Structure 1
Amino acid sequence: MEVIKKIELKERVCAKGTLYSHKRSKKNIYPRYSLITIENVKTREAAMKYVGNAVELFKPESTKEESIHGIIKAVHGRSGAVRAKFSRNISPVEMGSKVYIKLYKMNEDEI
C-alpha cells in the first residue's frame, strides 16, 4: 500500500510542524498566508535559518490531490513561529494538521 510507504519515506527525512492559524488581526483574516510552529525551534534567531525552505501538506484521504506544496516566507513574532504560502488557500477544516519541512530551498515562483 503506497500511502503507508510514502509516509515512512517522509518521516525519515523532514522536520515536523503544525498549522494553527491564518494571518489575522483582532477582526479580519488574510487567508493567503498561514502560520506554522516547528518542533524544537524557539527563538526568532533560530527560526531565521528556515526562511526559504519548502513545505508539504500530505493528505491521503483526499480524492482530488494527495499533496499541496508551499514555501516559508518570513519569521512571525519572538518565539520561533513562521509564515508560509501554498499553491492553494488552506481551508479552516485543515487547521491543527501536521506539516513537513523539507530541508532544501526553492524560489517563490515554483511553489
Structure 2
Amino acid sequence: MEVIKKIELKERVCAKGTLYSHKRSKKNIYPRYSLITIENVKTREAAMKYVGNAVELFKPESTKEESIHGIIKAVHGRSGAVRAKFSRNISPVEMGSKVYIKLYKMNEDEI
C-alpha cells in the first residue's frame, strides 16, 4: 500500500510542524498566508535559518490531490514561529494538521 510507504519515506527525512492559524488581526483574516510552529525551534534567531525552505501538506484521504506544496516566507513574532504560502488557500477544516519541512530551498515562483 503506497500511502503507508510514502509516509515512512517522508518521516525519515523532514522536520515536523503544525498549522495553527491564518494571518489575522483582532477582526479580519488574510487567508493567503498561514502560520506554522516547528518542533524544537524556539527563538527568532533560530527560526531565521528556515526562511526559504519548502513545505508539504500530505493528505491521503483526499480524492482530488494527495499533496499541496508551499514555501516559508518570513519569521513571525519572537518565539520561533513562521509564515508560509501554498499553491492553494488552506481551509479552516485543515487547521491543527501536521506539516513537513523539507530541508532544501526553492524560489517563490515554483511553489
Tell me the TM-score range normalised by the shorter chain: over 0.9
Give matches, 1:19-34, under 5 Å: 19-34=19-34
How far 1:49 moved relative to its partner? Answer: 0.0
Runs (4+) of structure 1 exceeding 4 A deviation are none
User: How many angstroms apart in 2 are the aligned matches of 1:68 and 1:52?
Assistant: 17
Write the deviation string for residues 3-53 of structure 1: whole angstroms up to 9, x where unpaired.
000000000000000000000000000000000000000000000000000
Structure 2 counterpart of 1:108: 108
How far 1:67 moved relative to its partner? Answer: 0.0
**Structure 1 counterpart SS, 2:85:** strand
How far 1:58 moved relative to its partner? Answer: 0.0
How far 1:56 moved relative to its partner? Answer: 0.0
Structure 1 counterpart of 2:65: 65
User: How many angstroms apart in 1 are the aligned matches of 2:108 and 2:5?
Assistant: 29
TM-align CA RMSD? 0.0
Unpaired segments ≥5 residues, structure 1? none
Unpaired segments ≥5 residues, structure 2? none
How far 1:101 moved relative to its partner? Answer: 0.0
Tell me how many residue pairs correspond in the alignment: 111
- Normalized against structure 2, the TM-score is what? 1.00
